[PDB]
Amino acid sequence: KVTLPPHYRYGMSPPGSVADKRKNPPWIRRRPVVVEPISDEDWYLFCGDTVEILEGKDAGKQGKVVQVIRQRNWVVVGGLNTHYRYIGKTMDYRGTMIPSEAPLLHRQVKLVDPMDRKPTEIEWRFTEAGERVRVSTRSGRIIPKPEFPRADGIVPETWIDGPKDTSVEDALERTYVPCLKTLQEEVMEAMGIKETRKYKKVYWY
Amino acid sequence: PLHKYPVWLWKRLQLREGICSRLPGHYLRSLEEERTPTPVHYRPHGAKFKINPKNGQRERVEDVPIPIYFPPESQRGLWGGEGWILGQIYANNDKLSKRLKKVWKPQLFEREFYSEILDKKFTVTVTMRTLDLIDEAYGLDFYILKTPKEDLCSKFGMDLKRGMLLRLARQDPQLHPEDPERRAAIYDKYKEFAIPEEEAEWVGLTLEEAIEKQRLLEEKDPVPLFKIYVAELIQQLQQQALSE
Amino acid sequence: GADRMSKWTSKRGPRSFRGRKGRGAKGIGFLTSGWRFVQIKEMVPEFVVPDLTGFKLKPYVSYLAPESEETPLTAAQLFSEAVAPAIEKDFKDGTFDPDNLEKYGFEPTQEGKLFQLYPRNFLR
Amino acid sequence: IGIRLTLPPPKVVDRWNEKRAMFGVYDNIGILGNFEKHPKELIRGPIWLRGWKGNELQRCIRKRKMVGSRMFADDLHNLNKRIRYLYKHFNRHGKFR
Amino acid sequence: MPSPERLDKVVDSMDALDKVVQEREDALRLLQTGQERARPGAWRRDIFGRIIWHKFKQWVIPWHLNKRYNRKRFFALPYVDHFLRLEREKRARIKARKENLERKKAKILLKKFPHLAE
Amino acid sequence: ARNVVYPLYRLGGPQLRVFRTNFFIQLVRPGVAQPEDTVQFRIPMEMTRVDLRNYLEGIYNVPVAAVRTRVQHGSNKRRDHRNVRIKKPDYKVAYVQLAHGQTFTFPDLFPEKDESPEGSAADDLYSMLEEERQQRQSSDPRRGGVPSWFGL
Amino acid sequence: LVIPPEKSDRSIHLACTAGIFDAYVPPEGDARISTERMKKTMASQVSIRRIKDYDANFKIKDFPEKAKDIFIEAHLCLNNSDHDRLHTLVTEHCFPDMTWDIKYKTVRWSFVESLEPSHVVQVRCSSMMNQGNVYGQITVRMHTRQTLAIYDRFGRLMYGQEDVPKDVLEYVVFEKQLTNPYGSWRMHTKIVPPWAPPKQPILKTVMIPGPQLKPEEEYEE
RNA sequence: CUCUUACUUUUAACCAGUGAAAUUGACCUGCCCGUGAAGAGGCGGGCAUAACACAGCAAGACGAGAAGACCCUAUGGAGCUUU
RNA sequence: CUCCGCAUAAGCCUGCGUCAGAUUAAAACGAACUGACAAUUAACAGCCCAAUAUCUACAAUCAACCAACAAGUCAUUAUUACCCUCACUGUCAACCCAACACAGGCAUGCUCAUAAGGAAAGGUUAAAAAAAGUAAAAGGAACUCGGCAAAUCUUACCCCG
RNA sequence: GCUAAACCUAGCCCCAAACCCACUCCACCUUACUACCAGACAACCUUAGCCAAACCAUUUACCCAAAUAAAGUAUAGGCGAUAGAAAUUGAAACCUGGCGCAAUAGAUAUAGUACCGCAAGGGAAAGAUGAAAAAUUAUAACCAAGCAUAAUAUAGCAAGGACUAACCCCUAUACCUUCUGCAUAAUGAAUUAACUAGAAAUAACUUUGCAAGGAGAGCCAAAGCUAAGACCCCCGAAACCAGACGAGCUACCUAAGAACAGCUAAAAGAGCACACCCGUCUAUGUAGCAAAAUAGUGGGAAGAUUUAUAGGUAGAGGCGACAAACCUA
């Protein structure tokens, strides 16, 4: 969609939002943030993962990751590493103070072992079936990928087809019989359109 | 920065890529060869060493060709290697006088020449030098075949060479169709210049003409995938029967 | 003083310039003497709209649909699904010759066809 | 104005990295190696400056002679003008004759 | 707009419909003709010396009789050779800057993260 | 159709037909007073008034009596931060008059009654902001700015 | 600022409620002491059981002593403006009330004595799984002597006296996030009875302006 | 013109709004005589002298403006004419 | 006051329409500034024409008398071919060329003093100097290089062309 | 106290290495970015000149494909300035580096964009919080000129000696440049910040090495030879030449258009007189409304008139009822 500037600074607010536009106007040119390069296969933190904070005020505490920002190697843990800010402030009302999480680098959190709730290092390994999963280094235990709600806000289980939603049986029905005819030719036969005039040859150059 | 190859080598690199790669080897070697033209507007020394009159010492001497300008109209005639001389002169042959621009133009004549191999007469614009070269070669047909490309200095002359070479290569019967004895006599006269027909077709062609000729030879309609897939299907079925 | 950067459209220039420039719409006829326009019926495109009565396909698909791998259609797949069964049936029977390739659906020349694959002479 | 109000970040220099620790090694390759290789063969850089020194005019002349054909058209034009200006400056201008 | 994501789904559905239909026509065109493109075209060198893919247009008279078509120049004269070199050298400078800058970034990156030696 | 090469027509040739048209039109509310039978559309530039007549009748089965079209010039006066003109795209406006005496009025696509859901909302964040504002009272002038949190 | 950007998976994590689930109205004349009773006790017991589910090692009897320590330490943080420690002792609903009006003022608060031991008057919990979180509120009756002396921005005495303690009878409401493993009991708000005696008058005199009337308008009785 | 006068408008001056330009080594920037690179606010001998606005004037600041167009110089140019 | 004005051509290209903006207009809270939304709808105008051969001495001026020279803007026929229909584009404005929201430049039609279009004075005071006008006793070029200017409105002559 | 100040990145420079680059659909040589009609038009052709010779007129280095050496030798040349070989000789060659720049620097570049010109063409300026802005009552402060807090008291290059004391007393003709000589009423400079100007051979000297030998083939040598150190600026013309771009202004011309009321005479390169064209005289204006105008007064106004549109003639030229006019102020 939006073609971001070459050195756009990603933040907590998603790009293209109202807050982001005010913080990052089209004419802004700030110093780039040096981000350690991590490959997609090397990345091992996902939404819903339980990690332990290593540095900060909440060192040693465990929480659930609610958002991951790959452009900054950021993980957001709900209710941890939080500072307090006023929200909904007006001229007459001072506002409401709420805890606000601060982003944490991937090196500032450590994934926890499901068997023993302690931080541990993990490596990407393939199982017998061939699936790629995360394996704890010290214990050799498979850490399943957490089940996080889909980004489109649609639950397949709690889904009811609407008046304009094709049913599964009709959608998956195979009515295509392969043939050496174009779409135009098949429609002419289907609708009974008859054309006897022949197309004259033309010069292409 | 710097180029990987020198600029003057860019033309030769292009001959190793693209359609020029697929040109015949014998034709490409002809372009690469650059022989020194026979001196026409300058007198060669004739010796590699000469004793300098002043110091009485043996000094190496070299022949530096005079630059020659060939007008485009020269390509429709046979000037015998002559051309316009674009140069400077000193007034009254005194180096202390003015340096003036001088152009020397050959005296052009219109003459009619008959080619025994081609059995045709051509009205070709020639100079007095061209007549002497033909006289020394004992005929126009000998002159065209004997004279190298760098000495002909005429696209028409090279085109005449290709026509004669093709007839000799093919033993073309269109030369006097009703006189088989006379046709064989002329071919026997010029049998020393006979070359294979494959090489004769590329004689005298420019780079652009050769590329166009090569493109036409390689120009063919793509084979429909229906025919290709039929061949694979038929072959695979036969192999299946053998295993059974 | 003229704006070189602005797009050159039919709204700029004298009366002759404005009437000659168009907006990309295709012509549907020609002008005869007296500036009379003759509209050719065949040059006007015809919208081939099918009957949608009793149609079970809707603009959207229910999310309870199993995910399927994407396999783009190629010439090899089309040949196998459409032509291979016809050739294999005749091969076993022993009646197969290159002369009858037109029986299996091969078209040696696109000339004489209402819809020519190359050069294309039909709209989308 | 014109002077910074805060100290610059400290300079951390690794005096014992691989480049500084092994600097000067093999500089006596000719003396201690039966003169098979001259020490000037260790110099890495422009092809027209390996084992050779000169003023600006001599460098411009040498570079044009060695890699002039490989230079870009704009770069070559500036080099040709530089030689012309340096020729006039050195051979015609100055305090001493 | 109520539920703006509905428009995106429809556009994707129609774009997929164009893709599926085009694949069937492209596959059929290869089988019957072998041509990779429905519209005829050829490689030409324009008046500026650049190699371009000239798409053929439909006409009612042959090309040699076309007054407007034959006013175009599909050949480059010798004076265009120098500008091709200058444009080629311009691209060389741009690519050289891009490659050299990437090496600068990597060296800066190692200073920030010295553990990336491996 | 747009962005396609129309097949060339020679006298006595076949009818030109389009099977999957890519012309997309949007019904727009007129900005000025119009007759009851007049319907306004925004159509692509490549779309002629002849196509729109066949477009509406062929697809929507709407009887059409007359079509008039015009080209609207989008504004090119805006300047970004670089002082570079921003061009609002030009669009073609088409006016369609219904055939058999039919009248069309643009409907109200955002009724106020439907925009108010009777069902209550249970948003924790929205409720917290509303509850705290009402629960907290304004400063008493007789207190003279003294904090009221302390019970002493 | 009211609502974050729409269609975001991340949501604001609240650490406390905005108000009291069921306000405890103290009986009239309770200060003089210094069927329905069973129903209130039974309702309190049910909420205590749910609290004991999340925290098995929890005792109601030990809470008033624990609540007293939290109350004293929370107010002592105002003397030195130790906002870092205050957040761990009071909820986010209580923090603006305590600190907004004393940002540019000096507060000298002290604890002298406890006239009567603290009694837990009500223990209640919110509706289960409001947004995946369950909160428990405990109201503690405190009748202690305190000393307050507030100074304005220029160090001049503004309210109270530094050496004269006075009796204070207030009902402090505490709150804890049961679902949060790291949650703890923190002060939430205070309940001011309608029958509570008025506070001591301030030192300075205040003028309350009348309506500002436009020339077209006229004053009315 | 002798020989000027009266009135009106604009400008003007004051009040309110907006707000240029050439210029400017630093200036705490007087008069007379003498002196001096030969015509002094700045030097010598005298005289005068609380501070600071506003409106006029054009004797001076060799006033501002344009590296004098006149003159000469340059082995500096150019146009034109010619035995 | 009315120098105009309305319209077309040319040029320009959304540049005083609505709403939300208190950003400015050489002052000023309306808007010519910002964002968003609207708009100019063809009959007028532009965009034209099968071939080959052939034809075309006699102006215009109220075109009739009359008198001209500088000697002039307007025309077909024969044969063959041809059954078809109303598309496309311009349409807004207080506008263009002059660095300007310039006392300048700017084609034609109509109105010939107006039915259309506009405001010389921010308020005050009523000094000099300066600018633009009106009036003047008696004299009437005594001014000055010169009747310049103003007023009045005229006679004779010379030089050069 | 304001105004401001401060920053470290964006990127860039020079090398190495390696031989780059074109097309989703649609449109694009006609008035480019324009679906659809009779072409036959087609490329080649010595650079000059500034400049040096203290003028200038012959002449005056310009990569031509192996580093070095032969050698600045043979040779050429108003035998002047200066130009300058060859035979022969014959080496090394591992991309990913920096005693390179850090927002007036480094590319012009955030960009060939804004803007300027009819066109060719010319060509900018700038940014700066933090881990987090889903922490914005945040990230303290101090620093140029300019001001404000805070106008001024006889007298004088504004200072010095001083003094109880700012002044009063005494002493003192700014600076640079240029000159026989400048306070000079000679030059330059309002002021602040940043930027802005000495590049090298020949010998010689000094300090090491080795020594009738020196030097890592060539060269020098009757104490020499090898190596190092150490000496040679900046801005400015009027011009000249080559190749492009310009007749939308103006000069003249071509094709086809338009305008000229009323009166006199009725014949008119005729008279009076609007529109219109021109610009005689005077005043105003002179950074103006205007890089040539306003007001009045004037010349012409059926003609060698005025004027709209398109086209033509281009700098060694055009064009010119010759004013050395005019050819985009």
Ligand code: MET
């Ligand atoms: C003498 O006359 C001299 N002032 C020159 C006058 S004309 C410039």
Ligand SMILES: [K+]
């Ligand atoms: K010198």
Ligand SMILES: [K+]
């Ligand atoms: K009077």
Ligand SMILES: [K+]
């Ligand atoms: K004066």
Ligand SMILES: [K+]
């Ligand atoms: K406009």
Ligand SMILES: [K+]
């Ligand atoms: K000076």
Ligand SMILES: [K+]
């Ligand atoms: K001087």
Ligand SMILES: [K+]
């Ligand atoms: K003097």
Ligand SMILES: [K+]
């Ligand atoms: K002087």
Ligand SMILES: [K+]
């Ligand atoms: K002077």
Ligand SMILES: [K+]
């Ligand atoms: K003006």
Ligand SMILES: [K+]
């Ligand atoms: K022209």
Ligand SMILES: [Mg+2]
């Ligand atoms: Mg422009």
Ligand SMILES: [Mg+2]
């Ligand atoms: Mg670039």
Ligand SMILES: [Mg+2]
């Ligand atoms: Mg229209």
Ligand SMILES: [Mg+2]
């Ligand atoms: Mg005044």
